């Protein structure tokens, strides 16, 4: 099935003697070198899409001071999150995938895995927080609220709290950062066992706290928001903008949900089927399927929630 | 709290709405407190207050349906508020009051007196609709929202109309703030 290592796991049998370290040999026996050529080029593509959108969001807020409102902070956060994925992830991956094997050593492996994962988690919980904010604002559940800058700060801070609750444990001994898939990119070890780092407890913790809870919250919040807008539209049959808002909001909520399922249900399904189907074995081609869907969110969560968001189309 | 400007005419009926307890009334409903400001809006009485109202939720504009003399006064006062640089996006709640006095007025006084171009038969359902159309004709603001209601002189209970309209205004604005619609 695979070559077990301390800092690594290469999905390829050593009974032949061919396998080498992912910190060592160009992994052209996992896949022909054309595949790693494309790999490095693809990281540069997403650098040249992600940093444009995500930096420009920050820049625009500076330029136009009309946008500096509490509700937009978590989208600024989202932009920030994806820039970790550009530099911690894509740039340092660029300098390794160009070779075929991970260049900056296992300490660079922890740095890459950490900052990439930190950005991905900040984005995840930014979207959870965004749904929560819109729920409270529109549905008015508490009904004795104002929502000021203090609440926006708590919302942003909470995403960093949760992101660290995921990205930092592999730095102290709860799971490990290792090269996954084609072994040029380091991430969480959700796919092997390791009793020294307690991978099983980490993976279960991940699946529930960092998937099921975010998904439940996002479905619930946007569900209540759509119900509220539908209900308002029902009562004001002759109010054109509410009928418009009903249709537009529902279009966007469906987009939001599908974006989040595309982004995370790959890792969720892969890790869960690794967990319950122990009699299995996957190689780099399929171990990078979930990495694919998650990494590209650095582009199209900024598109879906910032570009399409009606307070930034007017700067365009 | 909600800021509601209350405009119209001296004999339009807002004098009765304001009493449901710059002249400020503090009526309330559904854990939501309203600040209702009875002000003038003529021209000469409009620079006295327009510069110190900001964050006005809605403008309640009243019209005496039976009063043809003040009709064009109200049409132009309306136009000059609805299209006013401070209230170009502040949604309007339009009461056409004295519905029944108009229902009897129109029987003995054709609508053509103040709209000569009117070609319809002088029946309540058509003349009142024509008046409503004339006020909304002046909107000239894409997504303004004008919430209309025709009030049975004093014989009705039209505070609910105000609050449904205000909630609709509020949810539209909160969506706007979130970046949705
Ligand atoms: C380029 C790669 C990055 C930023 C990879 C990030 C990966 C994660 C944040 C993965 C998280 C999860 C698990 C490890 C298991 C359960 C599902 C997730 C998404 C919560
Ligand atoms: C597997 O065998 C290759 C053949 O030399 C060797 O280079 C590598 O270190 C071995 N790794 C493990 C984990 O046995």
Author numbering:
A (entry chain A): 2 to 317
B (entry chain B): 33 to 53, 185 to 231, 242 to 354
What does the paper say about this structure?
The light-sensitive visual receptor rhodopsin is the prototypical class A (rhodopsin-like) GPCR. It is activated by light-induced isomerization of the covalently bound ligand retinal. Upon activation, rhodopsin couples to and activates Gt (transducin), a member of the Gi/o subfamily, thus triggering the cyclic guanosine monophosphate cascade. Mini-G proteins comprise the guanosine triphosphatase (GTPase) domain of the α subunit of heterotrimeric G proteins and are fully capable of stabilizing GPCRs in their active state, generating characteristic changes in agonist affinity and recapitulating G protein specificity in vivo.
Here, we report the crystal structure of the stabilized constitutively active mutant of bovine rhodopsin N2C/M257Y/D282C in complex with mini-Go. These three mutations do not affect negatively the structure or functional properties of active rhodopsin. Attempts at creating a mini-G protein from Gt were unsuccessful, and therefore, we used the related Go (62% sequence identity). Crystals grew with p61 symmetry, in which the crystal packing is mainly mediated by hydrophilic contacts between mini-Go molecules. In the receptor, the major contact regions to mini-Go are located across the cytoplasmic ends of transmembrane helices TM2, TM3, TM5, TM6, and the TM7/H8 joint, with additional contacts mediated by the ICL3. The C-terminal portion of the α5 helix in mini-Go contributes most of the interactions to the receptor, as previously observed in Gs coupled to other GPCRs. In particular, the smaller outward movement of TM6 in the rhodopsin/mini-Go structure, coupled with the different tilt of the α5 helix in the G protein, results in most of the rhodopsin/mini-Go contacts being in TM6 and fewer in TM5. We observed that the conserved Gly352H5.24 of mini-Go forms a backbone–side chain interaction with Asn3108.47 in the receptor, placing it very close to the TM7/H8 joint. Surprisingly, the structure of rhodopsin in complex with mini-Go is virtually identical to all the previous structures of active rhodopsin (average RMSD, 0.51 ± 0.07 Å). While all these factors probably contribute to pulling the α5 helix to selectively activate specific G proteins, we suggest that another significant determinant in this mechanism is the precise placement of the C-terminal hook-like element of the G protein (its last four residues) relative to the TM7/H8 joint.
